[PDB]
Structures are given as C-alpha cells and as structure tokens.
Amino acid sequence: MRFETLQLHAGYEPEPTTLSRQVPIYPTTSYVFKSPEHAANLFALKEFGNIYSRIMNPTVDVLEKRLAALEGGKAALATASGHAAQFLALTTLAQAGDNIVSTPNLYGGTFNQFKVTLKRLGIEVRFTSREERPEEFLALTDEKTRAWWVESIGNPALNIPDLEALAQAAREKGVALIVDNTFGMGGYLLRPLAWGAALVTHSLTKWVGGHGAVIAGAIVDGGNFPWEGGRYPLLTEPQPGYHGLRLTEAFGELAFIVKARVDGLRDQGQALGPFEAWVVLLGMETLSLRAERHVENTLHLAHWLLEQPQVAWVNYPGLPHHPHHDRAQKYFKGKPGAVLTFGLKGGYEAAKRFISRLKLISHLANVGDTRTLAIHPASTTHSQLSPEEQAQAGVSPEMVRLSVGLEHVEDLKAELKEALA
Amino acid sequence: MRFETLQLHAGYEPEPTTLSRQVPIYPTTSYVFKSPEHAANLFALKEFGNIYSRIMNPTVDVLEKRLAALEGGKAALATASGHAAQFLALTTLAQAGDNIVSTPNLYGGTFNQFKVTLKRLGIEVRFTSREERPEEFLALTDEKTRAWWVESIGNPALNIPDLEALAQAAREKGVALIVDNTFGMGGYLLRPLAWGAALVTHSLTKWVGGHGAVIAGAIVDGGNFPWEGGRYPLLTEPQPGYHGLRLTEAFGELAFIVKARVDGLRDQGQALGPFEAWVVLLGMETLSLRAERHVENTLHLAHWLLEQPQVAWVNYPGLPHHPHHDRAQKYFKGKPGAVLTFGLKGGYEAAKRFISRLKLISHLANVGDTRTLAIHPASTTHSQLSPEEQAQAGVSPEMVRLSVGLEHVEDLKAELKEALA
Ligand SMILES: *Cc1c(COP(=O)(O)O)cnc(C)c1O
Numbered sequence: 124m125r126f127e128t129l130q131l132h133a134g135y136e137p138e139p140t141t142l143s144r145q146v147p148i149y150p151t152t153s154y155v156f157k158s159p160e161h162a163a164n165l166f167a168l169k170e171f172g173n174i175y176s177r178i179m180n181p182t183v184d185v186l187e188k189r190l191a192a193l194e195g196g197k198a199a200l201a202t203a204s205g206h207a208a209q210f211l212a213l214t215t216l217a218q219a220g221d222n223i224v225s226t227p228n229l230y231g232g233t234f235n236q237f238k239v240t241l242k243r244l245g246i247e248v249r250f251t252s253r254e255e256r257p258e259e260f261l262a263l264t265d266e267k268t269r270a271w272w273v274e275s276i277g278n279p280a281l282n283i284p285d286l287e288a289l290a291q292a293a294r295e296k297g298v299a300l301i302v303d304n305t306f307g308m309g310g311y312l313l314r315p316l317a318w319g320a321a322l323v324t325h326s327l328t329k330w331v332g333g334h335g336a337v338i339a340g341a342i343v344d345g346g347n348f349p350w351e352g353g354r355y356p357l358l359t360e361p362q363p364g365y366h367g368l369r370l371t372e373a374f375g376e377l378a379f380i381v382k383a384r385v386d387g388l389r390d391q392g393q394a395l396g397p398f399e400a401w402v403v404l405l406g407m408e409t410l411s412l413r414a415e416r417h418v419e420n421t422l423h424l425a426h427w428l429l430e431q432p433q434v435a436w437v438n439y440p441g442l443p444h445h446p447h448h449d450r451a452q453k454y455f456k457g458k459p460g461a462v463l464t465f466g467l468k469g470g471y472e473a474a475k476r477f478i479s480r481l482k483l484i485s486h487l488a489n490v491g492d493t494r495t496l497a498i499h500p501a502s503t504t505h506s507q508l509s510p511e512e513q514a515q516a517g518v519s520p521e522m523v524r525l526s527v528g529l530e531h532v533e534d535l536k537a538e539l540k541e542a543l544a
Numbered sequence: 545m546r547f548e549t550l551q552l553h554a555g556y557e558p559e560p561t562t563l564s565r566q567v568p569i570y571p572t573t574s575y576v577f578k579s580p581e582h583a584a585n586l587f588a589l590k591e592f593g594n595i596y597s598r599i600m601n602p603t604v605d606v607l608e609k610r611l612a613a614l615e616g617g618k619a620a621l622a623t624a625s626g627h628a629a630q631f632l633a634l635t636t637l638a639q640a641g642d643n644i645v646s647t648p649n650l651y652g653g654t655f656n657q658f659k660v661t662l663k664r665l666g667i668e669v670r671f672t673s674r675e676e677r678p679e680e681f682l683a684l685t686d687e688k689t690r691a692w693w694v695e696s697i698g699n700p701a702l703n704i705p706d707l708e709a710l711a712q713a714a715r716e717k718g719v720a721l722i723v724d725n726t727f728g729m730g731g732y733l734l735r736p737l738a739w740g741a742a743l744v745t746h747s748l749t750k751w752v753g754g755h756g757a758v759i760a761g762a763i764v765d766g767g768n769f770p771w772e773g774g775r776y777p778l779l780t781e782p783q784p785g786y787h788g789l790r791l792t793e794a795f796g797e798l799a800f801i802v803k804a805r806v807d808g809l810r811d812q813g814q815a816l817g818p819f820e821a822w823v824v825l826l827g828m829e830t831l832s833l834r835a836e837r838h839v840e841n842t843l844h845l846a847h848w849l850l851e852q853p854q855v856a857w858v859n860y861p862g863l864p865h866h867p868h869h870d871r872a873q874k875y876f877k878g879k880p881g882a883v884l885t886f887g888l889k890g891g892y893e894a895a896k897r898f899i900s901r902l903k904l905i906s907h908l909a910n911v912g913d914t915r916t917l918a919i920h921p922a923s924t925t926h927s928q929l930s931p932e933e934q935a936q937a938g939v940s941p942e943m944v945r946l947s948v949g950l951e952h953v954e955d956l957k958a959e960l961k962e963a964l965a
C-alpha cells in the first residue's frame with residue numbers, strides 16, 4: 124500500500140523555475156553563491172539541506188531522498204558504486220586500529236575489499252563461521268569493534284541471515300549492524316532497517332538501476348542508532364575538517380550520514396555523477412514491477428529446473444524444502460530475491476557445455492539486469508583457484524548461477540531446455 | 545569586442561533554485577501548470593516566453609537566445625537538424641501555389657529538398673544562374689514569390705554571393721532574403737543579418753556544434769523585415785490553429801519566428817531534444833576559438849597545397865588570386881570559412897589514391913568537425929551520376945574537398961604530403 128507511489132514521487136517536486144515534470148540533470152561542477160553569508164554558511168555546514176555543492180548535486184539528491192523513502196530510512200548518500208558505498212561507510216565509523224565483524228558469506232568483491240584493502244589500511248575484518256550466528260558476532264567483538272556486516276542474501280550459498288536476532292544482539296551490545304541489502308531490491312523485498320539494522324548499503328548497479336546501464340551505490344541511515352555510546356569517537360570527536368565541529372552535537376541522530384558526506388565523500392571523492400543518478404531514477408521508477416516479475420520468474424524456473432533430468436539439484440531459498448525456508452517467509456514474504464543456483468548431473472563439463480549453448484541468456488558475471496544472466500564460476504570467476512580452494516570457497520564444480528530476468532518464462536524454459544541438451 | 549563573451553553567457557542566468565553554473569538538461573516531455581489561468585494563457589499565446597511546453601524546452605531556449613545573440617539577431621528557433629530548419633522556414637512563409645527563388649549553388653541535400661520535396665508540396669523553386677546576380681533574382685520574382693535563398697558560401701565552387709546588393713534588392717522588392725549561414729560558423733565569420741538579410745538558417749551540426757556529435761539546426765530572425773506588405777498572407781491571416789489570432793498583430797516584428805514555433809513546429813514536430821541542445825551549447829562555448837584556428841589552418845593548407853608538385857589547382861576564396869577575393873574581404877574579413885577544394889594532376893585516379901592513403905584525415909561526407917575531413921565526390925557522393933551529369937553539377941573528376949580541422953598544421957602537412965605520393 125505506498126512503495127509504488129514513493130518510487131515515482133519521493134524526493135522531487137517540480138522545480139519552481141520551469142515546473143519540469145521529469146527530474147532535471149544538473150551536469151554542473153559548481154553553483155553560484157547566493158551571498159557571502161550563504162557561502163560562509165555552506166562551508167560551516169550551517170545550511171545543510173539547502174545549498175548545493177560539488178558534494179550535494181540536486182539530481183543526486185532526488186535519488187538519495189528517494190532511496191531513503193523506499194528503505195523506510197531517514198536519509199541516504201549516493202556514491203560512484205556499491206564497493207565505494209561499502210568503503211565509505213566502513214571508513215566513516217572505523218580507522219586504523221579498529222576492526223569489524225563480518226559474515227564470510229560475501230559477494231566476491233566485498234570479500235576482497237575486507238581482506239586486502241581494509242587490512243592494508245589497518246582495519247581488521249574478523250570473520251564469523253559460515254553459519255553467521257549472533258553468538259559468533261558477539262564472541263568476536265571487542266572495545267574497538269566498529270560494525271557488524273552481513274548481506275540480506277549471502278554470497279555463494281544464498282543463505283538468509285538471522286536478522287531479527289542479529290539486530291537485537293548488535294543493539295544490545297551497542298554495535299552498528301550494517302546490512303548489504305543489494306539482494307533486497309532497494310527495500311522492496313526487505314527493509315533491514317525495519318528489523319533494527321543501523322545502516323543499509325546498496326550496489327544500485329544491480330536491481331535498483333535495473334537495466335544494466337549504470338554503476339552506482341548508496342548508504343541509507345535509519346537515524347535511530349545511538350552514536351553517543353563511546354564506541355564511535357570518529358562520530359563524536361571535534362572535527363578537524365570543520366574547525367572542531369561536533370557532528371553528534373550539530374546533527375543529532377543523522378550524524379553518520381552527515382559525516383559520510385561532509386567528511387568521507389568530501390575527502391575521498393567517490394561522487395556519483397548526475398546523468399548516472401538520473402539513469403538510476405529511471406530504473407527506480409519501475410522497481411516494484413520488475414521486482415515482482417523477477418521473483419515470479421525465479422520461483423517458476425526453480426521448480427521447473429528440478430523437474431529436469433540433467434539437473435542434480437537447485438538452490439533457491441524460496442523452494443519449499445530449503446534449509447532457510449522459514450526465513451524466506453519471515454523476511455522476504457516468500458520472495459527471497461532473483462538469483463538461483465543449480466548443479467548439473469554431468470558436472471563441470473556439462474556446466475561448461477550449458478553456458479556455451481546459451482543464446483538468449485547472457486554469459487557474464489553481473490546480476491540484476493532485466494535480462495537473464497548465467498555464470499559457471501568454476502570455469503571462470505574462480506578459475507584461478509585450485510579445485511580444492513574452490514570447494515573451500517563454497518564453489519562447487521557443477522554449479523551454475525542464474526540471475527533471473529524478465530523475459531517471458533516460456534521463452535526462458537525453451538532456452539534452458541535447449542541449453543541443457 | 546564581445547562575441548567571446550556572448551558565446552559563454554548569453555541566454556542563461558544561473559537557475560534560481562539550485563544556482564547551477566552550467567545549464568541544466570530538462571529531459572522532460574511536460575511541465576506542471578502553475579494554475580488553470582497560466583494554462584489558459586499558454587494555449588492562447590498570452591504569456592509567450594515565460595511558460596515552458598513540449599515546443600519551448602528550457603535547455604533549448606538557452607541555445608536559441610544564444611544563437612540569436614551570436615548572429616546579432618533578435619530571436620531563434622531550434623530544430624532537429626539543418627534540413628528541418630530550412631523546411632520549417634520555407635514552410636512558414638510559403639504554401640502550395642507559392643514559389644521561391646534560389647541560387648543553384650546549393651549544399652547537396654538542400655538542392656534535393658528544393659527540387660523534390662518542396663516541388664511535391666507545390667512550392668516551386670526557381671533557379672538563378674550560377675552567378676546568382678541580384679537582377680536574376682528580381683527577374684524570377686513574382687506576386688507569389690515568397691523568399692530568395694542563398695548560402696554564405698555556395699557549393700561546390702565556394703563562391704561568395706553578392707550579399708549587400710542582394711539584400712538591398714530583396715528589401716527594395718519586399719521579399720524575405722534568407723541566408724543559409726552555416727559556413728559562417730554561427731555569425732562568427734559573418735552576420736548576414738548585419739548586411740540586411742531577413743532570416744538566417746544553420747546546420748548547427750557543422751561548426752557551431754563543432755565536435756561532430758550532434759545533429760541540429762536553427763532559424764534566426766532579425767525582427768526587422770516588414771511582413772505586413774501583402775506578400776505574406778500566411779503571416780497576417782487570422783490563424784486557424786489559434787482561434788483566428790493574427791500573429792502580425794499580437795507579435796509585431798517577431799511574427800515570423802513566433803509563427804515558426806507555435807504553428808509549423810507545433811504541427812510538424814522537428815523538436816530539437818535537450819541533450820542534443822546541451823551538447824551544442826558545449827561546442828558553442830569555444831566557437832570563436834575553433835573558428836580562428838580553423839580558418840588559419842585552412843589558409844596555411846591552401847598555400848601549402850599549391851606548392852605541391854601533384855596538385856593542379858586549389859580553390860579557396862581566401863587565396864589572393866581567387867575570383868571573388870574582394871568578396872572574401874568585404875564579407876568575411878579575409879576569413880571565408882574552412883572548406884577548400886583542390887585538383888590532383890593525376891586526375892580521378894590520383895584522387896581515389898589520395899583518399900585511400902589518408903590515416904589521420906577521415907574519409908567521410910560531412911564538414912565542420914574539429915577533425916580534418918576529406919572527400920572525393922566523383923567517386924563517392926556523386927558516383928551514380930554519369931561524368932557528364934557530374935560536370936554539369938560543377939563536380940570535376942579530379943576534385944577533392946577538404947574540410948580543415950584543428951590538428952597541428954605540421955601534422956596535417958606531413959599527412960597530406962604522404963597521402964599525395
Ligand atoms: C555488485 C555488488 C556489490 C558492489 O557492487 P558495485 O558493482 O561496485 O556496485 C556489493 N554487494 C553486492 C551484493 C553486489 O552484488
């Protein structure tokens with residue numbers, strides 16, 4: 124009752140000068156200053172929402188306010204990519220010396236970001252077991268623990284975390300729980316903030332954008348996590364970039380999203396650009412319609428793939444006899460995303476053959492386009508790893524990953540049948 | 545003493561809402577109506593320049609006002625291309641039964657437009673001889689003559705017309721003289737309105753655009769030609785699209801550019817789109833700088849080509865022995881555009897060979913890019929005419945057309961020398 128209307132209207136009222144119905148693109152680097160006073164105010168953070176700059180573009184501003192509305196959150200901040208949003212978030216609450224605790228069931232790229240990049244910058248990422256229990260989160264946390272990280276639907280095995288208990292635990296302890304909600308389609312399938320996460324992160328490049336046209340990421344702040352504790356000196360310190368201003372004092376419950384902007388984004392410069400933000404808004408306008416058709420296509424193909432003689436198994440979490448099926452229902456109302464996995468009975472060789480017979484389905488490594496995508500990681504993504512380190516990563520040699528698009532399901536059935544022969 | 549500043553500022557003040565320094569792109573189909581009264585006014589032509597619509601876009605509006613300023617004119621109107629600007633102009637002042645008189649030294653596409661398209665819609669185009677003398681215009685004029693057409697620099701001989709005398713003659717007769725000023729680089733090299741033309745037309749796709757990136761055209765109105773004479777019932781009639789409004793009464797000296805918008809553009813729909821307009825404004829920003837380097841490069845190469853053993857002749861109206869050299873001086877301050885022509889002494893074959901040895905210069909049919917362009921019309925553009933109907937068109941079989949770009953003239957010399965062996 125309302126997502127459908129937010130995704131068309133939240134964050135933008137027709138611009139007063141032109142009364143344009145569509146959001147304008149402001150391919151600008153700069154904004155003339157209304158007066159020296161307004162200009163003094165901008166640099167002092169005294170007129171926050173109202174003066175535009177190299178770090179708040181008005182086209183990007185619509186995207187942000189809209190995303191916050193779609194996630195049930197209070198404010199959002201866009202960046203040049205999902206990776207840059209994860210990095211800017213973590214780097215806003217943590218500095219060299221700190222650590223964070225993460226599920227290890229991570230998107231290939233976020234694993235490496237944790238293990239190599241953050242490590243090098245003196246931010247220790249400690250990993251839970253693959254079952255990512257709240258106990259193990261708690262067990263790994265100490266005075267310098269700065270966040271816990273988990274994904275709405277985890278990387279290789281498509282597990283759903285134990286989100287309610289995780290959130291209660293993190294809050295109980297006073298750690299910011301951050302959920303990478305990319306697989307929750309912008310809050311449509313799931314809003315982690317509603318279940319008590321502190322912060323959400325997205326690769327908008329995937330289903331929010333939707334059309335495989337732009338790379339983009341975002342952080343969404345619920346505005347309800349106490350930064351005051353003593354766990355977040357970075358948020359409470361007087362701020363050297365702003366002449367000793369205290370962000371928790373000037374901005375209260377929004378101090379995080381404000382800091383990520385005026386400090387992290389200001390210094391590191393992962394600007395999302397305005398055309399790109401504009402192209403995201405376009406895909407956001409149909410987010411719920413694509414979401415629904417995605418998830419229906421995915422269920423249908425999950426069932427169908429099992430009835431197939433050449434298929435050993437299928438891993439979608441919305442299948443009835445799945446490990447985490449109760450969780451699919453609790454969190455995603457029965458609709459846990461649009462990525463499934465399946466093993467071929469003819470193994471690695473047959474998986475390779477299947478990819479080579481694809482015609483309509485595209486052979487590539489992304490997820491979340493309108494078009495249906497397939498990859499055989501064992502021969503591709505992870506082909507640099509030995510089979511033993513592969514199996515180590517949860518990558519089984521006969522597994523194909525399907526990111527199910529919006530084509531007619533009968534056309535997809537015909538294609539899969541052909542490719543599987 | 546001002547063109548340089550006009551091409552950066554005319555037509556746009558930072559939008560009051562965002563104070564954007566760059567001009568926004570308004571990729572919008574519509575504008576919300578402020579109130580029903582404002583909407584009544586828009587449809588009645590009552591608050592002309594102030595309310596935006598599908599036929600006045602604000603990004604396109606900046607390009608128009610800016611071009612009018614660069615031409616010394618009063619108002620302009622943009623279209624989806626140079627052809628469409630020419631068709632919309634002629635179709636605004638002429639209807640079935642009328643005729644117009646034109647030089648026949650026309651850009652390839654405009655010839656066809658006159659001879660096939662206009663003819664079929666019952667608008668007769670009568671041709672002067674190749675010397676386009678004002679008295680030949682007069683000779684061909686009658687009660688129903690609606691305009692005279694000439695180009696600032698005609699094709700293919702690169703003749704410059706007898707512009708002052710032509711303009712006096714047309715005005716003394718009360719016919720609209722229209723100059724296709726494309727080769728005048730948006731008013732930079734020449735402003736026909738300053739010499740008394742009624743209207744100017746451009747293929748913005750060429751030097752005004754400048755980067756070969758966008759197709760675009762425009763009409764520019766001097767706002768000083770009397771339409772009330774009885775020669776222009778189309779302009780004075782009560783107007784059936786607007787409940788019998790008389791455009792000469794409501795808009796006085798701007799009635800033509802207004803009609804072209806609210807009537808011809810509204811019915812025919814050659815909209816220039818706003819990205820495209822935005823990209824033109826970007827090239828307009830450097831027009832004068834490109835213009836000067838173009839014309840310098842052209843002179844140097846015109847001289848250099850004559851010293852070349854393999855070159856029989858060079859046609860460039862800025863060479864000092866040229867027929868119409870006095871005219872280059874009167875009209876273009878010594879700088880008559882950036883297209884030249886030259887014949888190879890090894891004829892058609894050597895011309896084909898030269899084009900086949902180009903590396904840096906691009907082989908294509910088009911003028912006015914930043915990059916230097918070459919074509920051999922006898923083997924290409926006109927390859928379907930017999931040699932004698934070729935010679936008839938002024939297309940001699942050894943002629944190469946060079947549209948001279950902005951690369952370093954020494955690199956161009958090294959390339960030509962070597963293409964010419
Ligand atoms: C893509 C991805 C990332 C970050 O992606 P970008 O390509 O930088 O936008 C993070 N998390 C998930 C779940 C993703 O699939």
Ligand SMILES: *Cc1c(COP(=O)(O)O)cnc(C)c1O
Binds near residue numbers: 750
């Ligand atoms: C190209 C051209 C035209 C029209 O050009 P478009 O490609 O439609 O924009 C008209 N006159 C001249 C002199 C031109 O070179």
